[PDB]
Amino acid sequence: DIAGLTPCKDSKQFAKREKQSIKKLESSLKLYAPDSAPALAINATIEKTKRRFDNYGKQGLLCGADGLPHLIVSGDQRHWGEFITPGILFLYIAGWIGWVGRSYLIAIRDDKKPTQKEIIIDVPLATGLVFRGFSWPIAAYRELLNGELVAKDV
Amino acid sequence: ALRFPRFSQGLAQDPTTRRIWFGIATAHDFESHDDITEGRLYQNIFASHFGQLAIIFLWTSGNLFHVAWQGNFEAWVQDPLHVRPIAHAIWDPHFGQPAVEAFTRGGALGPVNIAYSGVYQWWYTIGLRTNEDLYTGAIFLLFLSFISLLAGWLHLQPKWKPSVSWFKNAESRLNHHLSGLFGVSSLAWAGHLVHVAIPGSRGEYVRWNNFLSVLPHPQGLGPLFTGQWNLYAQNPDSSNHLFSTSQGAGTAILTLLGGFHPQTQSLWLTDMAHHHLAIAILFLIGGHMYRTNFGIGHSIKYILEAHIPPGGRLGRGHKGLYDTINNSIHFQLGLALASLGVITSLVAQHMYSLPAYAFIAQDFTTQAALYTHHQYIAGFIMTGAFAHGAIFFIRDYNPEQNADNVLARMLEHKEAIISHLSWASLFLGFHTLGLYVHNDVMLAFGTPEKQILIEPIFAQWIQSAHGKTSYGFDVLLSSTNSPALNAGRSIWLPGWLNAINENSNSLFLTIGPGDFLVHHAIALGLHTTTLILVKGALDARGSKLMPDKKDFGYSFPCDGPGRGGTCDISAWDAFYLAVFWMLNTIGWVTFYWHWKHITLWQGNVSQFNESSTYLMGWLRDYLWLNSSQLINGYNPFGMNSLSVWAWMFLFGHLVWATGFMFLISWRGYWQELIETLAWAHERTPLANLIRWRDKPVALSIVQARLVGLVHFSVGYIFTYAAFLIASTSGKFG
Amino acid sequence: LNPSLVISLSTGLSLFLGRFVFFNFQRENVAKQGLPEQNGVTHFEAGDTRAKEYVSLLKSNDPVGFNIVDVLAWGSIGHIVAYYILATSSNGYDPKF
Amino acid sequence: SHSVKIYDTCIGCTQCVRACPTDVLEMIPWGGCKAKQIASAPRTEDCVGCKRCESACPTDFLSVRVYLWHETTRSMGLAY
Amino acid sequence: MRDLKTYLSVAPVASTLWFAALAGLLIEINRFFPDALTFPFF
Amino acid sequence: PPIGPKRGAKVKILRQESYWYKGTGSVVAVDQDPNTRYPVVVRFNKVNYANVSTNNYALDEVEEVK
Amino acid sequence: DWMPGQPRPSYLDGSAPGDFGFDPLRLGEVPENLERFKESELIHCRWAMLAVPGILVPEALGLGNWVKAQEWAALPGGQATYLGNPVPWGTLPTILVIEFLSIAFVEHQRSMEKDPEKKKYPGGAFDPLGYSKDPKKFHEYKIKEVKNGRLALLAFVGICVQQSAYPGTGPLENLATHLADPWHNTIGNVLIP
Numbered sequence A: 001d002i003a004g005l006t007p008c009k010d011s012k013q014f015a016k017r018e019k020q021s022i023k024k025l026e027s028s029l030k031l032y033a034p035d036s037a038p039a040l041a042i043n044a045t046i047e048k049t050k051r052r053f054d055n056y057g058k059q060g061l062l063c064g065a066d067g068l069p070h071l072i073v074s075g076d077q078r079h080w081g082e083f084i085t086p087g088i089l090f091l092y093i094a095g096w097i098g099w100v101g102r103s104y105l106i107a108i109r110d111d112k113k114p115t116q117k118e119i120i121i122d123v124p125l126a127t128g129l130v131f132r133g134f135s136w137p138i139a140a141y142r143e144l145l146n147g148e149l150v151a152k153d154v
Numbered sequence B: 001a002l003r004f005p006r007f008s009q010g011l012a013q014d015p016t017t018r019r020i021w022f023g024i025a026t027a028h029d030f031e032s033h034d035d036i037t038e039g040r041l042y043q044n045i046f047a048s049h050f051g052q053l054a055i056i057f058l059w060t061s062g063n064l065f066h067v068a069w070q071g072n073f074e075a076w077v078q079d080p081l082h083v084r085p086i087a088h089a090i091w092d093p094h095f096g097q098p099a100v101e102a103f104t105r106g107g108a109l110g111p112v113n114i115a116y117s118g119v120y121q122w123w124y125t126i127g128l129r130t131n132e133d134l135y136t137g138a139i140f141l142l143f144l145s146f147i148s149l150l151a152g153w154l155h156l157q158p159k160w161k162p163s164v165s166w167f168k169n170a171e172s173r174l175n176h177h178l179s180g181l182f183g184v185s186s187l188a189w190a191g192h193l194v195h196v197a198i199p200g201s202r203g204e205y206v207r208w209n210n211f212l213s214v215l216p217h218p219q220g221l222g223p224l225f226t227g228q229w230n231l232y233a234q235n236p237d238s239s240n241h242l243f244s245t246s247q248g249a250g251t252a253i254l255t256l257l258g259g260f261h262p263q264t265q266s267l268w269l270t271d272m273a274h275h276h277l278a279i280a281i282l283f284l285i286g287g288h289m290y291r292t293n294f295g296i297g298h299s300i301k302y303i304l305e306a307h308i309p310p311g312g313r314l315g316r317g318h319k320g321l322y323d324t325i326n327n328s329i330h331f332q333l334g335l336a337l338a339s340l341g342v343i344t345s346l347v348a349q350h351m352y353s354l355p356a357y358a359f360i361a362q363d364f365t366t367q368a369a370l371y372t373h374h375q376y377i378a379g380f381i382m383t384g385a386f387a388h389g390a391i392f393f394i395r396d397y398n399p400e401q402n403a404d405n406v407l408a409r410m411l412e413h414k415e416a417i418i419s420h421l422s423w424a425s426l427f428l429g430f431h432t433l434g435l436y437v438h439n440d441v442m443l444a445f446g447t448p449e450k451q452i453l454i455e456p457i458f459a460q461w462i463q464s465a466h467g468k469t470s471y472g473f474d475v476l477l478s479s480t481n482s483p484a485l486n487a488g489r490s491i492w493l494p495g496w497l498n499a500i501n502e503n504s505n506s507l508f509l510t511i512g513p514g515d516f517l518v519h520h521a522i523a524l525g526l527h528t529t530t531l532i533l534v535k536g537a538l539d540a541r542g543s544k545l546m547p548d549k550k551d552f553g554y555s556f557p558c559d560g561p562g563r564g565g566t567c568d569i570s571a572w573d574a575f576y577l578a579v580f581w582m583l584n585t586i587g588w589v590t591f592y593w594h595w596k597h598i599t600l601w602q603g604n605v606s607q608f609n610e611s612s613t614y615l616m617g618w619l620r621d622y623l624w625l626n627s628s629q630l631i632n633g634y635n636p637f638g639m640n641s642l643s644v645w646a647w648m649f650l651f652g653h654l655v656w657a658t659g660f661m662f663l664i665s666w667r668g669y670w671q672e673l674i675e676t677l678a679w680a681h682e683r684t685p686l687a688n689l690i691r692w693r694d695k696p697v698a699l700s701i702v703q704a705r706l707v708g709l710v711h712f713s714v715g716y717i718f719t720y721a722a723f724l725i726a727s728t729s730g731k732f733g
Numbered sequence C: 001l002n003p004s005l006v007i008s009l010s011t012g013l014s015l016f017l018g019r020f021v022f023f024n025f026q027r028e029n030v031a032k033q034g035l036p037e038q039n040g041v042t043h044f045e046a047g048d049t050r051a052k053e054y055v056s057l058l059k060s061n062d063p064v065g066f067n068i069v070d071v072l073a074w075g076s077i078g079h080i081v082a083y084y085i086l087a088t089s090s091n092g093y094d095p096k097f
Numbered sequence D: 001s002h003s004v005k006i007y008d009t010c011i012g013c014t015q016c017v018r019a020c021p022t023d024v025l026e027m028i029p030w031g032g033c034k035a036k037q038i039a040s041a042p043r044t045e046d047c048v049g050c051k052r053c054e055s056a057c058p059t060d061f062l063s064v065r066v067y068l069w070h071e072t073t074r075s076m077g078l079a080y
Numbered sequence E: 001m002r003d004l005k006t007y008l009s010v011a012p013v014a015s016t017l018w019f020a021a022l023a024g025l026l027i028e029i030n031r032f033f034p035d036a037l038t039f040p041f042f
Numbered sequence F: 001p002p003i004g005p006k007r008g009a010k011v012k013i014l015r016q017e018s019y020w021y022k023g024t025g026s027v028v029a030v031d032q033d034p035n036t037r038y039p040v041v042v043r044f045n046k047v048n049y050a051n052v053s054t055n056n057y058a059l060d061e062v063e064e065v066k
Numbered sequence G: 001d002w003m004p005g006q007p008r009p010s011y012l013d014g015s016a017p018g019d020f021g022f023d024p025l026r027l028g029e030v031p032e033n034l035e036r037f038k039e040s041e042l043i044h045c046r047w048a049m050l051a052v053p054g055i056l057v058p059e060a061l062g063l064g065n066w067v068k069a070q071e072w073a074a075l076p077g078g079q080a081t082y083l084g085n086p087v088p089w090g091t092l093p094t095i096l097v098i099e100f101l102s103i104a105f106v107e108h109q110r111s112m113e114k115d116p117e118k119k120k121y122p123g124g125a126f127d128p129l130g131y132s133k134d135p136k137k138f139h140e141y142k143i144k145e146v147k148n149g150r151l152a153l154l155a156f157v158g159i160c161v162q163q164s165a166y167p168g169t170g171p172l173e174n175l176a177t178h179l180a181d182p183w184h185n186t187i188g189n190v191l192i193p
């Protein structure tokens, strides 16, 4: 397939890893009781392992000769769940944080003692500003067209 | 004067030991000596160049003479794969008998050293066969050393010293260096290959006493003038040839095949002769550009002044750069060092993937040694290329004469350059270290399937475009009917595709997640070293914390503790900080190369591919695992021939640590200690009858930094060299 | 194919072009570029003995001013063209459509 | 002996002369400032180069400057 | 009491609270949707 | 007729060795007596590296901004 | 105006033949750039106006399309054919040399003039019937020439893009393919394959 990687459903190495880890867990299990709390913890971990391997099977990830999952970030459309849509999520959240921070900085810059509001936050003001990040993209766009994002004469 | 040193009167009147130290470390900075002219500076540098040339010839003379005298060459030529080449003999009176027995190898009659420079393979490749050739060459090199010295002397008297404006004729020098120094030399080397080495690898021994009587081709110089050059490639060496024999030999002298020689896993000799001829033609034609005494050609200054884009986005363009470059020697040296550094690591990258010498790809230790040597020298050359830019900005830069051209414009937005370099290096560091730590944690918890393993799909794509068929991309040279594969299928594409698709050479090794991560670490290193050096250069004329820095020189301790404190504010200090990052970066690069290759040479590539993605893998499976033989070189039960490396390994660890002292402890503490000692001595009987002549003092601040850095990097190089050689030589595989 | 035929054909064409088509454009570009200068003066007027133009052989009895140097330059242009033509016309190389 | 130079931006606050540990500096009369005062450096053969004067100057940028130069016995602060 | 409200908004306390809440949020997310390597939704 | 910018004006600094160079400050006093080479006294919004917030300037190092 | 309701450039008033106020990239913000650009525009327009009949006519005839007609050259025994007759001097190298010499001579001749009104409208030995009689029908002819030239350039680039979409086709084969099923053979099939 892409870069020679075959699917984790069809990968024998992927399966081998799954069953090796599972029965290593279950060899560590055969102790303490068949019902004591340690046994219950170990069985929960076994079930979580099965869920993890099966989910990676469902999601159509690519495996190599190692038997572990690989990531395709080229832009191919069968793999946007790997990098590009979590990347869009990240860029949105990051811009949110930074936009709120810059608007707070601007809001307090005209105070007589601006440093007093830097080391001691004005929490009601920030509470009014937190939710503008929700539309930070549109605002930042109309602030770029306005000639309003970049400090003139710097 | 009236004292050492003569060049500085200010140092000569220094009554402390400082006078001696600084006397030595200022001896070649000619621009800082008393009564210096332009002519004296230029003439000193010319004679110094001649001295360095003599040095190089004497050193290569020594190597030739010593392997011809105490060496192994003759037996090595009979079986290059089953004998170890000798460097020279050991005579050490502190030796005990078991060490005497331990170091006696290679068939010698006493203790010797094995060579790893690779000179047996290189000299064998170009034609030398018996000890008389090596003796001959050594004597000729001695002669050329003496002639170099004679010219150096001759060009220092009157009646023979050139003028400053002879040295400032740039068009003349470039014409000669392009068509004479690069073109004629490459033509004569193509000649040596066609006349001596191509026959040498076919059984015949052409030498000075018979070469006028042996044709290099069956129809000598006929084809060349009649025009049909193709006859020179009409019968290549068959692909079952044995190097220094006639079995399977052809007659061609120039080819274009692409592949390797099947037996030696090396480049064809005919390919290299043809390459040198081609580039010599290019250089000769291109060395006729600029104008001289004959009324045709180009003025460099006019080309530079005519290149200004309308719309004024580059300001005044390049107007006035000819005189900025022609009048500054530090500018020219920075340019020279930058170009030479880039092509030095290009040498490193091309000599391991496309070996030129026969039976050198099968000598693993020489491969690793050569690669590490050339990469480290390239790194030092880069740091110097950037240092002389800051020296140029301080000393020789003239603002009003460069008004509004590209250079002053660089100075005008230094904040935007430094800020973006800073952003880039922050980004790379954050994400690279973050993914490595993610992976390490994932494996500590027993879940290696939870790793983040990004696949380098762009480098895999570029490898496909060169004809690799391991990733099924089917692009240029890897597709079926594309014009790229179609237009070259007849000449070099067979050999190239045959070599690139073999998986026991080093031509485009397979890559995976580990390669991705370490390549981003390499990018981080390059960006951060560039940030340090560029900031040091662009801030050397002054900053906001010290706006008059240019009035203080390239190197000075500080500006005292005022204004918050100014430790390490000179541009010399930026260089000193950048050397650490250079060493770290070359470390990452060479660790990558050596681990990948040592697992490939063992048929255990999956080991690297699995352990390279988390840092515990690097620490345990590369550093710890490959150290056993070296550190067992000597032990309570005896010593073997790894002893000298087991010793050296520790030397490097010691020197390094001593460098920490000079770097962490600073001057005042030591000066007070020394005052105490001076009292003690002056007060003791039978010993105060002895009087020093220089008052002892602690070292200087800049001096202490330099001495610490020297210890640090000496320790660095020595420990890594010992480990690399002992861990490849111990396996010899 | 016939070497000297092609050789002198390419050479004569190059020299004719140099003397009758580009001779003006070339002289104008050489005039406007001029002699190389260091610090405002030419290389001779700063004290370089060996960097003085060769006025003696440059002068010529041509009606327009063709001399030995133009002949050398353009003639070898023609020679390089002739050799490229010869080599690739006898090299047997063939791409494919 | 180091070099010490006084520049005409001096406001004549005398803070540099009070700080010198070897008595290099001095106040002299002037006419270019409200204080009619200016610093001078008549005794630079005794300067140890501590820059204690520069830490004391309030003008922007400095009005007293110390350029470290050739070293002697007095300049190095040697008692032996 | 007002002085306490001010003190609680001094930098170290504010950051402590902000990050403890953020930590609880990410911890609970990962306790509900464990071992995520991709965006499996759309 | 007095000299220089008005008291409490907004001026831009042109002395490139200054910390506040190409920034702005507010005039507070302009020494009218000639024989002073730096009459204008400017107070700034931020302190420099020496923890100082006011400095004297000449008449041409100061340019009135609006 | 090229965009009703869009302010004109200051340096483009509307007197030049073809000025409709179109220069969104301000590449003609320098006058001595704009003069060269006018001469350059006319040269390109004239080459394309001569070319597109040379691309359409022989394909409408019983000959091969503009790409097919230049394919003997990439084979060793190449030999051209005009109107179905084997060109005697048809081999490649003679053609390359002759093309070079002739084109170089005429193009340098063009470069050696400095009017700069002659650079775009020399006339004389190039205006036989003397259509430069009257300066008012003259300006009209200039506008019609430049307008047809911009149309011709549009059509030549259209030919090239349709070529790279359907390799091994001609323009008239494209027109036939489109008249054979108008609602089904259109650009959509090469923009959403």
Ligand code: CLA
Pocket (backbone or CB within 6 Å): B422, B425, B426, B427, B428, B429, B430, B433, B524, B528, B531, B532, B577, B578, B580, B581
């Ligand atoms: C292992 C040692 C080490 C490390 C990690 C660094 C790291 C760094 N150096 Mg440095 N350096 C070192 C040794 C080191 N150096 C030495 C020995 C020298 C010679 C004196 C230098 C000299 C030097 C210079 C001159 C410069 C740097 C620069 C930098 C920064 C480069 C930008 C970057 O990569 O982004 C970030 C990379 C990182 C690795 C940061 C890692 C730390 C993360 C954020 C930990 C996260 C904290 C976490 C939440 C828990 C906190 C715990 C809590 C108790 C606080 C970076 C932070 C350059 C710079 O400043 O760039 C702008 C620069 O100019 N270095």
Ligand code: CLA
Pocket (backbone or CB within 6 Å): B046, B049, B050, B053, B166, B167, B169, B170, B172, B173, B174, B176, B177, B179, B180, B181, B182, B185
């Ligand atoms: C054809 C005429 C000619 C020639 C041959 C030279 C030759 C030389 N000149 Mg000179 N020069 C000339 C004319 C000429 N010059 C004129 C007319 C002027 C006046 C304008 C000057 C002014 C001048 C000055 C002022 C200086 C020189 C210098 C030099 C020396 C350069 C240093 C060196 O040897 O490195 C060797 C360089 C090469 C061999 C070519 C570069 C090779 C590249 C970088 C890579 C090689 C690739 C290959 C893989 C290497 C193989 C490795 C393997 C064998 C191990 C060199 C021998 C310097 C000097 O003389 O030092 C004493 C110097 O100071 N020249």
Ligand code: CLA
Pocket (backbone or CB within 6 Å): B024, B025, B026, B027, B028, B029, B030, B380, B381, B382, B383, B384, B385, B387, B391, B554, B555, B572, B575, B710, B714
């Ligand atoms: C062709 C290359 C070249 C040339 C001609 C020069 C020339 C010059 N350099 Mg330069 N430089 C270069 C490359 C070069 N450099 C490179 C590659 C670097 C990066 C390392 C530098 C970095 C550099 C700096 C930072 C400085 C110079 C300076 C200078 C000037 C005076 C140097 C001097 O004599 O001080 C004296 C020479 C020494 C003190 C060398 C002795 C100490 C060395 C480092 C110890 C050697 C290690 C040890 C002995 C070996 C191992 C020990 C053993 C156990 C094996 C001079 C004009 C200095 C200057 O004056 O500014 C203009 C300056 O400060 N250079």
Ligand code: CLA
Pocket (backbone or CB within 6 Å): B654, B657, B658, B659, B660, B661, B662, B664, B665
């Ligand atoms: C491995 C690194 C290293 C080494 C070797 C030393 C060594 C030394 N330190 Mg130091 N130190 C270090 C790291 C190191 N330090 C670091 C990182 C720091 C920063 C915190 C300091 C901070 C520090 C301070 C503050 C002080 C010292 C002091 C001393 C000296 C102690 C007196 C002594 O033991 O004499 C004996 C010498 C040795 C043990 C060195 C080894 C001796 C060798 C093996 C002898 C070989 C001789 C050989 C044949 C020479 C001939 C070779 C020929 C080619 C020339 C000593 C020379 C103290 C001092 O000066 O005491 C008076 C002092 O106060 N150190």
Ligand SMILES: CCCCCCCCCCCCCCCC(=O)OC[C@H](COP(=O)(O)OC[C@@H](O)CO)OC(=O)CCCCCCCCCCCCCCC
Pocket (backbone or CB within 6 Å): B006, B007, B027, B030, B033, B036, B044, B047, B048, B050, B051, B052, B054, B055, B152
């Ligand atoms: C194989 C030999 C290796 C050396 C080749 C290099 C020599 C050829 C070029 C030299 C040009 C001399 C320029 C005039 C310089 C000159 O001759 O001027 C004479 C010099 C006086 O100095 P000046 O007043 O001329 O100083 C002006 C300076 O700016 C010029 O450099 O007096 C001395 O000889 C001091 C001797 C100290 C010797 C110190 C010992 C250093 C040991 C190593 C020395 C080199 C050996 C290298 C081997 C590793």
Ligand SMILES: CC1=C(/C=C/C(C)=C/C=C/C(C)=C/C=C/C=C(C)/C=C/C=C(C)/C=C/C2=C(C)CCCC2(C)C)C(C)(C)CCC1
Pocket (backbone or CB within 6 Å): B330, B331, B332, B334, B335, B338, B342, B385, B386, B388, B389, B390, B392, B393, B537
């Ligand atoms: C500071 C300073 C200085 C110095 C500087 C430096 C040091 C720089 C550098 C730099 C560098 C270090 C650079 C580099 C570079 C590189 C480049 C620029 C490249 C390239 C190329 C290309 C583009 C390629 C292409 C290709 C081919 C050819 C084929 C194959 C494919 C490819 C694509 C690859 C000086 C003195 C000057 C001045 C003063 C200041």
Ligand SMILES: CC1=C(/C=C/C(C)=C/C=C/C(C)=C\C=C/C=C(C)/C=C/C=C(C)/C=C/C2=C(C)CCCC2(C)C)C(C)(C)CCC1
Pocket (backbone or CB within 6 Å): B281, C011, C015, C071, C072, C073, C074, C075, C076, C077, C079, C080, C083
């Ligand atoms: C007298 C006269 C005349 C005549 C003229 C003539 C006859 C001419 C000429 C001329 C010529 C006829 C010239 C030539 C030539 C030159 C040159 C200068 C050359 C060259 C070449 C080169 C330089 C190179 C070569 C090569 C080599 C060596 C190697 C391989 C290949 C090659 C190609 C690279 C007439 C009547 C018309 C007119 C009047 C006057």
